[PDB]
Write a protein that binds this ligand. Structure first.
Ligand SMILES: [Mg+2]
Ligand SMILES: [Mg+2]
Ligand SMILES: [Mg+2]
Ligand SMILES: [Mg+2]
Ligand SMILES: [Mg+2]
Ligand SMILES: [Mg+2]
Ligand SMILES: [Mg+2]
Ligand SMILES: [Mg+2]
Ligand SMILES: [Mg+2]
Ligand SMILES: [Mg+2]
Ligand SMILES: [Mg+2]
Ligand SMILES: [Mg+2]
Ligand SMILES: [Mg+2]
Ligand SMILES: [Mg+2]
Ligand SMILES: [Mg+2]
Ligand SMILES: [Mg+2]
Ligand SMILES: [Mg+2]
Ligand SMILES: [Mg+2]
Ligand SMILES: [Mg+2]
Ligand SMILES: [Mg+2]
Ligand SMILES: [Mg+2]
Ligand SMILES: [Mg+2]
Ligand SMILES: [Mg+2]
Ligand SMILES: [Mg+2]
Ligand SMILES: [Mg+2]
Ligand SMILES: [Mg+2]
Ligand SMILES: [Mg+2]
Ligand SMILES: [Mg+2]
Ligand SMILES: [Mg+2]
Ligand SMILES: [Mg+2]
Ligand SMILES: [Mg+2]
Ligand SMILES: [Mg+2]
Ligand SMILES: [Mg+2]
Ligand SMILES: [Mg+2]
Ligand SMILES: [Mg+2]
Ligand SMILES: [Mg+2]
Ligand SMILES: [Mg+2]
Ligand SMILES: [Mg+2]
Ligand SMILES: [Mg+2]
Ligand SMILES: [Mg+2]
Ligand SMILES: [Mg+2]
Ligand SMILES: [Mg+2]
Ligand SMILES: [Mg+2]
Ligand SMILES: [Mg+2]
Ligand SMILES: [Mg+2]
Ligand SMILES: [Mg+2]
Ligand SMILES: [Mg+2]
Ligand SMILES: [Mg+2]
Ligand SMILES: [Mg+2]
Ligand SMILES: [Mg+2]
Ligand SMILES: [Mg+2]
Ligand SMILES: [Mg+2]
Ligand SMILES: [Mg+2]
Ligand SMILES: [Mg+2]
Ligand SMILES: [Mg+2]
Ligand SMILES: [Mg+2]
Ligand SMILES: [Mg+2]
Ligand SMILES: [Mg+2]
Ligand SMILES: [Mg+2]
Ligand SMILES: [Mg+2]
Ligand SMILES: [Mg+2]
Ligand SMILES: [Mg+2]
Ligand SMILES: [Mg+2]
Ligand SMILES: [Mg+2]
Ligand SMILES: [Mg+2]
Ligand SMILES: [Mg+2]
Ligand SMILES: [Mg+2]
Ligand SMILES: [Mg+2]
Ligand SMILES: [Mg+2]
Ligand SMILES: [Mg+2]
Ligand SMILES: [Mg+2]
Ligand SMILES: [Mg+2]
Ligand SMILES: [Mg+2]
Ligand SMILES: [Mg+2]
Ligand SMILES: [Zn+2]
Lengths: 63, 97, 64
RNA sequence: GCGAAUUCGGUGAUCCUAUGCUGCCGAGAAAAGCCUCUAGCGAGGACAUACACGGCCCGUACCCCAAACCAACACAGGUG
RNA sequence: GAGUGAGAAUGCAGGCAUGAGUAGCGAUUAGGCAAGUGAGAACCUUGCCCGCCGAAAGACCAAGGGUUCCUGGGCCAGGCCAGUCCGCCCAGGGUGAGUCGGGACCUAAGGCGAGGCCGACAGGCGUAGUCGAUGGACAACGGGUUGAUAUUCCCGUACC
RNA sequence: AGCUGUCAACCGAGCGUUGAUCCGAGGAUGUCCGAAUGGGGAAACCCGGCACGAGUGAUGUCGUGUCACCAGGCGCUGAAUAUAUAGGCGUCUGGGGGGAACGCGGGGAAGUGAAACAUCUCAGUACCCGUAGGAAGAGAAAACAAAAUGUGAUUCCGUGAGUAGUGGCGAGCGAAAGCGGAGGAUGGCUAAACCGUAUGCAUGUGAUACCGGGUAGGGGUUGUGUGUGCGGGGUUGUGGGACCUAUCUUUCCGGCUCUACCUGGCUGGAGGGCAGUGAGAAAAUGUUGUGGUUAGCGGAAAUGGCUUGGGAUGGCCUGCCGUAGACGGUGAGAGCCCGGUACGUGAAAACCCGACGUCUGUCUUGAUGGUGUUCCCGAGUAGCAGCGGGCCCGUGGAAUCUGCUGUGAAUCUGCCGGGACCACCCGGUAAGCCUGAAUACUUCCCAGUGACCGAUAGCGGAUUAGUACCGUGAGGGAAU
């Protein structure tokens, strides 16, 4: 839940608000998953931490 | 540069009533730099005074702590060495009694 | 102790010779004043002068 | 400086044999050293003894159930 | 132009009073006398009795302190008093190890930690290892010494 | 011509006309701890390996170097296994800690005010964290404005204004546009719409398909798609650029568009430019100011007289010089006594900024104006949905920016800005990159200033000062 290795995405911090509109500091942790994706066309694939946005971008290929 | 010589170690001899109680018994007292060793001091005394020594005993005397209005005064730490020449018994005339 | 005019025009074997004799004189003089038979300081200072400059000239002509 | 005798017996431990023996359950550390076995070498090591030799650095005084440590004291306290 | 006017805020810092030459002088043991030094002696030194502890109030060690140890000098400051005395102060001297205690040997609880994992970041973990005794392997006595040090110095005999 | 720093004297030993000491520039020596880096460790202390030498009859022993970690390149090797990778080695270049403030970028509260208090404010304050610099960040419009044929990068002040506004519309918070100022450089290019080469990956109707007139010699730029890498040529507001067809064209040679022959399209080499330590290519090759600095030298003019007087620098009187009548001391208020002041001078050596001669780099295969017509100019981005931040803007009708999570566009009759929203007209081209000048700060150094204090004041510290002392702590903290 820290940083996906390629686009350099780090968690930002913000405040939760109530119906009474009360502030309280909270956290947003980015969607990153441990997946093993192909790097060279021979079909080898290594476990790296990639965020879901990057996976959707397809910056790492699927095979 | 600098070469290795044995008599870069001896600071001085010490004169005292105990030192004379030893001088009568063919055992001598010398003041020696702290970073020395009995082997080095043995080789030094042998080479310098052409006497074949048996063994050397060394002791460390912690410095005193003398009063002064300026503040807390401490003297330097000194190392005394006890040396005992062999049965050959060659007095060191350089000691000057 | 000796002038640089002589020192720079003199050679390797001779600064080796004055090197050993100056170490020998440092030995002797420091430890007669250690024994307490010696009085003044300038002797150790000038033999220090000699050893320092001979070591400097040694590395100087070694590099050059 | 000189310098006599220097044995018997008995009592006797919480000390030694004992890291032992007997019994209990609540069932009682580690590694180094030591002995030995081979893998990987190898043309000179193995056991005793007469002899001269060489074995480092540091602590080493004093106080220590106290006027010297901890309690602001030369303190009716505490300290293994 | 003002840090410009104090008598108080259980004000602040310094100094000095009364209570006052009043209470106390730190135990369950207790002294007295003689001679000696000294200008001064219950308090120090030497001699004889008495008193007390004696599983300590004796003798050693570890932790701790660091010269309080010994000798010589002096007693305005310190010792709850005077003090020649002192653990006062000034000077000098004093601590001797192949074999006693640690390092060159090894580990427990636990600490550090290459890479590695996790963590916006600072960081937190723990592998190989390396540290970490309160533990284990591995080598002594009698006597003598001066004014103070003795299983260290010397004599005598050995060890690993 | 004196000198061996001070408390702090005192002795004794001595150095100097050959110039000692003193002040400056450069150089070396530089124990140990401390990033500490051969390993370890309770800081200034314990323990080793490797190479070259000294010494003993040998050892023991003694000196000199070298031995931390991480990152980034080079060469070798390649495990599970065959290709190949991790890991493993050897060598260079970098970084590690400290510093008062200033700055960027993330984290980030409460005491308080609202006379309570939750929105709010306190406040993006304190503090923590990782960065480099001497300044940093920002910086060339996807900016304003509103019909004027306007401003024209960024930065920092004074206005505009406590105004338009926000706010349990309370406490409170708070613009922008425009104007006046400081400073100047409206500034050069990369990368996709053709190609040559290092290439491979694939195949081959392996012969009439490839070269820019004529004759002739020779024998896969895949046929078609997908994806990446390498390059000449398109980076735009009146809205702009090439797969092909129309007009002048300020040198030449070669090789190409799978070949040899006019037309059309690219690349290598000789000569005017553009510039260069730049932010738009990067590494190198060598040069003078009385600019300054770290330090010094010269530098006028009464022993004047008389008196109180211990001493005059005092009182009076002559005559003092002055491009110097600032300041201290000497026995009392001294420009005429000295330290010195105006003013001149002066550096062997070293350092920072400013010119002047080998050498280096580029293109003049290129350049300037002229008539119609057939994939590229920054992508998981702009934008959208939800959830939050920061601009006055606290979900209010809410533009603009950013972020987390899902979706998701065109390439010019494309877009977004013009403060919920659009038809016709109006102004600029987003996802890429950097860039000096004005500014803030002062641990340090120099020269000065003060209607600032004169020992309970002024820094805690004019003196053993962050010392004694207290607290095992972060620390607190004196008097003299
Ligand atoms: Mg991460
Ligand atoms: Mg934030
Ligand atoms: Mg809050
Ligand atoms: Mg999808
Ligand atoms: Mg010894
Ligand atoms: Mg004292
Ligand atoms: Mg029994
Ligand atoms: Mg031996
Ligand atoms: Mg030692
Ligand atoms: Mg002892
Ligand atoms: Mg003691
Ligand atoms: Mg005792
Ligand atoms: Mg106490
Ligand atoms: Mg007491
Ligand atoms: Mg007590
Ligand atoms: Mg007890
Ligand atoms: Mg006032
Ligand atoms: Mg008053
Ligand atoms: Mg008062
Ligand atoms: Mg009261
Ligand atoms: Mg009173
Ligand atoms: Mg009474
Ligand atoms: Mg009473
Ligand atoms: Mg008492
Ligand atoms: Mg008496
Ligand atoms: Mg009793
Ligand atoms: Mg008892
Ligand atoms: Mg008893
Ligand atoms: Mg202890
Ligand atoms: Mg101790
Ligand atoms: Mg005593
Ligand atoms: Mg005395
Ligand atoms: Mg007295
Ligand atoms: Mg007193
Ligand atoms: Mg004393
Ligand atoms: Mg660990
Ligand atoms: Mg690590
Ligand atoms: Mg571990
Ligand atoms: Mg360890
Ligand atoms: Mg241990
Ligand atoms: Mg003892
Ligand atoms: Mg003993
Ligand atoms: Mg110099
Ligand atoms: Mg050197
Ligand atoms: Mg280190
Ligand atoms: Mg280390
Ligand atoms: Mg590399
Ligand atoms: Mg392979
Ligand atoms: Mg740094
Ligand atoms: Mg609050
Ligand atoms: Mg409030
Ligand atoms: Mg209120
Ligand atoms: Mg710079
Ligand atoms: Mg800029
Ligand atoms: Mg305004
Ligand atoms: Mg208000
Ligand atoms: Mg605000
Ligand atoms: Mg091109
Ligand atoms: Mg081009
Ligand atoms: Mg137009
Ligand atoms: Mg002058
Ligand atoms: Mg007069
Ligand atoms: Mg006058
Ligand atoms: Mg004046
Ligand atoms: Mg006057
Ligand atoms: Mg004056
Ligand atoms: Mg004067
Ligand atoms: Mg809003
Ligand atoms: Mg809005
Ligand atoms: Mg554009
Ligand atoms: Mg930009
Ligand atoms: Mg600027
Ligand atoms: Mg006063
Ligand atoms: Mg403390
Ligand atoms: Zn990602």
């Amino acid at each position: 839940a820290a940083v996906c290795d390629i686009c350099g995405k780090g968690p930002g911090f913000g405040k939760s608000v109530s119906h009474s509109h009360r502030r309280t500091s909270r956290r947003w942790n980015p969607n990153i998953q441990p997946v093993r994706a192909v790097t060279r066309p021979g079909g080898n694939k290594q476990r790296i931490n990639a965020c879901t946005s990057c996976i959707k971008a397809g910056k790492v290929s699927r095979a | 540069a600098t070469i290795t010589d044995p008599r870069d170690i001896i600071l001085a001899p010490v004169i005292s009533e105990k030192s004379y109680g030893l001088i009568e018994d063919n055992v001598y007292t010398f003041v020696v730099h702290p970073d020395s060793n009995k082997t080095q001091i043995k080789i030094a005394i042998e080479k310098i005074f052409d006497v074949k020594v048996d063994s050397v005993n060394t002791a460390n005397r912690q410095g005193k702590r003398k009063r002064t209005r300026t503040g807390f005064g401490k003297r330097k730490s000194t190392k005394r060495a006890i040396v005992k020449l062999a049965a050959g018994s060659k007095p060191i005339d350089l000691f000057g009694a | 102790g000796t002038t640089p005019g002589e020192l720079r025009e003199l050679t390797d074997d001779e600064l080796k010779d004055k090197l050993r004799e100056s170490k020998e004189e440092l030995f002797n003089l420091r430890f007669q004043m250690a024994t307490g038979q010696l009085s003044n300081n300038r002797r150790l200072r000038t033999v220090r002068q000699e050893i320092a400059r001979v070591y400097t000239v040694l590395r100087e002509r070694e590099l050059g």
